């Protein structure tokens, strides 16, 4: 059904995402158990890590487009990523390495993430009908690798330890590299312009140097979130001023402010919602016992299921508004399950969390998928920078919001943690509902401006 290169891209993306979500599923627990962080420290540190992983994304698109070539930058990103996973494995011998390791993973994602998509777009004559199914299938690939990693990494970390989990993330990257290398001939005429001139070692060195400096900067900022906060705060106020000096562009501004809320809420899955499953949910479903950390897998699961269906099935302003309503309902459901459907001992049915993750995945499908493809219709570089910088700030804020559910290490009673989760999730749901109503009200005007 699809070009031959498409399948190579499918599997390279699947395996890289396997490595990344292998780390994301276990990181907050790894901070708490293995490094002795409080839940508050773990949450904000995870926020800063996600902030850097997603804010550096604009670097790798530049490097792929104008310095090294899309294919070369894919390989270089995979190598730096594999290195970072193996360094995280090494952190168990050398705890002082951890932030450097995480810094190395962030720079790697930043270098590699824009580039498979780019390459895939170039596998299709510019108006190929197959394109849309191709990008749906690409998203499904991301979410299959994520589903497997989120399901299995906590089980592996429990049975064999963090060293083996992280080394397997490295192996995932190595097998991404090997499938790319073994399929190189399939993409011989596909690439960006530097892919077909000999590689410039001047520019390759500038990229290695800037990458290393960036690794040390990321490591510092994850160590000192209290100034990552200020860096991103001042950068946001300043670039806000330089966007206000300089109508569809305003449409993007409103949409991004709404996206910020969506990203705050998404940031809850690896932190607050993860600990809510640990502390106040039954760890058994349909008769099987599970690692509650694996509950995070419910996000890619529902995505993998709903994307074909929703591919078969107002337009953009409305689609964003719908996604925000679904998200609101995800957290209101969590709150209701805690307020009215808990056991005498403070535990709730895992079917409530299955439903929470359904609502949140549907919000993801309506906002995320549409967001990126279509911010492009309204508009370039300045706004793209703004998008990444704001998504990143959203992850820092998500970390901060998660800290309102942090539990001290000596609390052992579910009846003490349940009201905390229910209060925070209910307020999140009500604020997101208000944001969704405002969005609905602005839908007609916004649909005017898009004209």
């Amino acid at each position, epitope marked *: 059904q699809q070009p031959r290169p498409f399948f190579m891209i499918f599997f390279v993306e699947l395996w890289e995402r396997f490595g990344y979500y292998g780390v994301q599923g276990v990181l907050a627990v790894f901070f708490v158990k293995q490094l002795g962080f409080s839940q508050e420290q773990a949450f904000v540190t995870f926020g800063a890590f996600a902030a850097l992983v997603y804010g550096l994304i604009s670097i790798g698109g530049y490097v792929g487009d104008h310095l090294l070539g899309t294919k070369r930058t894919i390989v270089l990103g995979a190598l730096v990523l594999a290195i970072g996973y193996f360094m995280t494995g090494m952190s168990l011998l050398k705890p002082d390495l951890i932030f450097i390791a995480l810094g190395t993973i962030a720079v790697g994602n930043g270098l590699f993430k824009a580039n498979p998509a780019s390459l895939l777009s170039k596998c299709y004559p510019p108006k190929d009908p197959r394109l849309d199914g191709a990008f749906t299938l690409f998203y499904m690939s991301i979410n299959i690798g994520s589903l497997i990693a989120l399901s299995l990494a906590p089980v592996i970390a*429990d049975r064999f330890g963090y060293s083996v989990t992280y080394n397997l993330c490295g192996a995932g990257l190595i097998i991404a590299l090997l499938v790319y290398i073994a399929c190189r001939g399939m993409v011989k005429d596909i690439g960006s312009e530097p892919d077909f001139r000999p590689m410039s070692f001047s520019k390759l060195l500038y990229v290695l140097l800037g990458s290393v400096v960036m690794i040390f900067v990321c490591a510092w900022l994850m160590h000192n979130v209290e100034v990552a906060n200020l860096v991103l705060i001042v950068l946001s106020i300043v670039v806000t001023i330089i966007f206000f000096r300089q109508n569809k562009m305003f449409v993007a501004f409103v949409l991004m402010l709404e996206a910020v809320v969506f990203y705050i809420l998404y940031a809850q899955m690896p932190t607050s919602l993860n600990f809510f499953a*640990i502390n*106040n949910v039954h*760890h058994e479903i349909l008769g099987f*016992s599970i690692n509650p950390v694996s509950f995070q897998a419910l996000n890619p699961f529902w995505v993998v299921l709903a994307s074909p269906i929703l591919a078969g099935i107002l337009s953009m302003p409305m689609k964003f508004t719908l996604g925000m309503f679904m998200c609101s309902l995800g957290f209101l459901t969590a709150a209701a399950a805690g307020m009215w459907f808990a056991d005498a*001992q*403070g*535990l709730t049915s895992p079917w409530f969390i299955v439903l929470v993750y359904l609502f949140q995945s549907l919000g993801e499908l309506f906002i995320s998928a549409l967001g990126l493809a279509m911010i492009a219709a309204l508009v370039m570089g300045f706004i793209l920078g703004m998008w990444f910088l704001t998504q990143a700030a959203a992850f820092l804020l998500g970390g901060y919001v998660a800290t309102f559910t942090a539990v001290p290490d000596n609390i*052992t*009673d579910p009846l003490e943690t349940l009201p905390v989760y229910t209060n925070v999730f209910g307020k999140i749901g009500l604020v997101t509902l208000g944001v969704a109503v405002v969005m609905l009200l602005m839908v007609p005007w916004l649909k005017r401006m898009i004209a």
Partner: nanobody
Amino acid sequence: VQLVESGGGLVQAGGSLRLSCAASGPTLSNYAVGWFRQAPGKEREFVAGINWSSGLRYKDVVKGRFTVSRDNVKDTVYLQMNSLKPEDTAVYYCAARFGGMLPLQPSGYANWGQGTQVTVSS
């Protein structure tokens, strides 16, 4: 996933026993371990437990007599039982739940030992 209890036995009022719980494949360090006990003709009840990060919980009638503790090197959890009285006679079970909570009912726990008999004679 499978726990082994050891150390039960028969002892006189005021004596001491130490139970120990050990796990097979998984690392018990991620688990809160609760000690339950079933006396003849009664339900299992929570007795004492330690979470994955040294939080502790005790049933009221055993406070000041039992201590739960954990040795993370040997991957073992202990229930030291002092000043034993006849009404501590029971089958004792260790149960494991991932994380930091110690819920009071057996349903909050999916992993269970087989039970060791403790008898305290007057």
